[PDB]
Amino acid sequence: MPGPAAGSRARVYAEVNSLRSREYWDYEAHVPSWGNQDDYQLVRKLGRGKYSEVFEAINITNNERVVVKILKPVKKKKIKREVKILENLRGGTNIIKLIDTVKDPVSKTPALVFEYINNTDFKQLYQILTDFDIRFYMYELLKALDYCHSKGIMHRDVKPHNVMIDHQQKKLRLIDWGLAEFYHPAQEYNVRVASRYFKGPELLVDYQMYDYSLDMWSLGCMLASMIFRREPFFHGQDNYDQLVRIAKVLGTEELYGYLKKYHIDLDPHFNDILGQHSRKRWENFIHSENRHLVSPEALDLLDKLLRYDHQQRLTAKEAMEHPYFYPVVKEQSQ
Ligand SMILES: CC(C)Nc1ccc2cnn(-c3cncc(-n4ccc(CC(=O)O)c4)n3)c2c1
Numbered sequence: 001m002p003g004p005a006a007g008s009r010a011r012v013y014a015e016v017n018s019l020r021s022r023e024y025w026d027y028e029a030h031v032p033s034w035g036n037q038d039d040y041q042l043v044r045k046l047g048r049g050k051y052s053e054v055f056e057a058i059n060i061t062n063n064e065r066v067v068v069k070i071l072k073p074v075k076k077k078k079i080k081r082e083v084k085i086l087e088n089l090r091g092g093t094n095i096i097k098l099i100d101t102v103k104d105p106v107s108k109t110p111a112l113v114f115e116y117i118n119n120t121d122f123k124q125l126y127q128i129l130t131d132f133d134i135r136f137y138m139y140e141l142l143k144a145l146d147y148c149h150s151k152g153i154m155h156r157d158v159k160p161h162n163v164m165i166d167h168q169q170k171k172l173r174l175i176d177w178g179l180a181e182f183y184h185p186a187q188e189y190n191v192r193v194a195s196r197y198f199k200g201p202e203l204l205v206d207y208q209m210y211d212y213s214l215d216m217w218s219l220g221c222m223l224a225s226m227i228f229r230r231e232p233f234f235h236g237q238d239n240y241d242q243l244v245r246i247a248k249v250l251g252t253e254e255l256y257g258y259l260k261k262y263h264i265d266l267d268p269h270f271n272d273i274l275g276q277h278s279r280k281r282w283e284n285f286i287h288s289e290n291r292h293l294v295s296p297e298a299l300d301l302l303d304k305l306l307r308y309d310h311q312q313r314l315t316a317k318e319a320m321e322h323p324y325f326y327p328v329v330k331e332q333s334q
Contacts, residue, residue, distance in 0.1 A: 005263035007186055010211040012315045017152040017184055025152065025182045027084030028077065037104025040113065042068055051078075052178065056116070066099060070111040071178075079110060082178050085153060086112070089177070092151075094144035096164075096175040117173045119164035126160070126226060128167075131293055132327060134226050137165060138219075139325045140172040145219060146316030148180075149212040155180045156193050158218030160231075183211055194218065196242055197232035201250075202310040204243045205264045213310045220305035220313075227298045229290045244273050250308050251279035258308035297324035 010016075017025045042055040052071035059066055073079065086098040097115040104111050141163060148155060155162075156179040164173045179193050188208035194200070200217035202210050224233040234249070236242030247255055252274055259266055282302060286294045301324040304314045314322065 003263060003265070007209045008211065008262070008311055009185055010183060010213075011311055012212060012317070013149055013152055013183070014211075015185055016150075017182060020152070024088070025184070027081040027182070030080055030084035032083045032087070032101045034110060035100055035102030035113075037068075037102065037106045037111065040066070040068055040102070040104075057113075059113075065116050067114045067116045068111055069114065070104065070107075070109060072107075072109065078178065081181070083112075085180055085182075086177055088151065089148060089153070092144070092147045094140050094172050094174055095147060096173050096177070114175065115173075117164045117171060117175075118166045118168065119175075120167055122160035122163070122165070122231075125165065125167060126231065127229075129226065129293070131295065133167075134293065135297075135325050135327050137163075137172050138223055138226070139320060139328055139330065141174065141219065141222075142316060142319050142325075144172070144174040145215050146320065149215060149316040152183050153180055154183055154212045154215045156214065157195065157198075158215055158222065159195050159198050160222065163222070196236055196239055197221065197234060199239075199242065200310060201243065201246055201255075201258070201308055204239075205259060205266065207262065207264065207310075210310060212316065213313055216305060216313050216316065216319075217310070219319075220302070223298070224302060224306060227290065227293050227302065228285045229293070230285075240269055240273060243270060244275075247274055248277040249280055250306065252277045254279055255308060261309060295324075300324065 039059055039061050040057050041060050042057040045053065045055040046067070047054040051074050052069045054067070054069045057066055057068045058064060071079070083101055089095045090098050099113040099115055102111055102113055103109060145155070155174065155177060157176070162174060162176045164175050165171070181189070186209060189210055191203040191206045191208055191210075194203060194214070198218040198221045200210070200214050202214065202217070221233055225231045234242060234245040236245040282299045301314070301319070301322050305319075307313050
């Protein structure tokens with residue numbers, strides 16, 4: 001309509017799924033097999049969301065501790081898909097492992113039996129960390145991101161509560177994948193995904209032509225909080241204040257340029273809201289309280305991540321080939 005808008009495309013795996021069997025991305029056509037519950041004794045309920053309840057369980061057959069989740073047939077679509085995706089991920093570094101899709105004849109409803117990892121909530125955890133114990137998980141976390149990205153998939157919801165971490169042992173597993181989806185070269189994607197603290201700026205202007213990049217802003221948000229000490233860093237209010245909380249960091253001007261870059265009329269409102277703020281040196285957040293966590297690296301890596309242009313951001317991999325993570329000879333030396 002008068003006032004066209006280019007659009008975007010994945011800058012990295014922009015065409016992956018295509019050069020692939022339809023079977024693959026056609027999850028609406030994915031009829032997975034199921035198992036009973038009976039084989040599983042749901043010990044203690046860890047959590048649950050709007051559609052899924054989540055318990056700690058153990059496979060009766062072989063006293064093996066495991067995690068299980070269930071969720072009414074809200075949209076056999078989501079369900080259908082969530083499954084295909086996960087099978088399509090299994091065997092992926094730091095990617096939650098889907099043990100087996102079973103339908104607890106309990107209600108005669110489907111459930112997932114995920115591997116079990118001993119999570120310790122970032123709340124307590126995100127404070128004992130260290131310049132090291134951070135680069136370490138980020139990178140780790142990343143290895144996950146880049147992998148699902150490499151496989152044409154953008155989780156669509158990055159946040160602490162989806163990033164378990166066994167600090168004792170020392171492992172990371174980006175659990176969950178119920179909001180994720182497939183990435184095909186240009187497709188208006190609901191913008192109503194993610195959380196009111198990570199949802200990227202892009203998903204504020206209701207800009208659907210997003211991609212893997214989204215998985216990075218989030219990843220961006222954590223890092224900052226992890227490095228500076230704010231949780232969340234952009235602790236927003238109205239799904240709209242969440243745009244200003246940012247605006248004050250990336251810049252009000254710098255912002256428009258972005259919406260100019262992609263023909264975007266900023267919904268009214270923000271007018272009264274926004275104001276005229278100017279990009280803030282990330283140093284404007286480094287005080288005693290976090291002095292030891294920061295460093296030029298994180299500030300560097302951080303600037304190239306938390307950016308408006310949902311395109312000009314570091315890639316899932318580039319991230320890993322970035323300096324800040326050098327401190328990790330990534331156990332693999334060859
Ligand atoms: C349940 C999630 C939302 N949060 C949560 C909250 C408290 C806790 C405590 N431990 N814990 C936990 C531990 N191991 C595995 C999973 N798990 C395996 C897959 C999924 C869920 C999935 O992958 O969808 C979760 N969750 C929690 C996990």
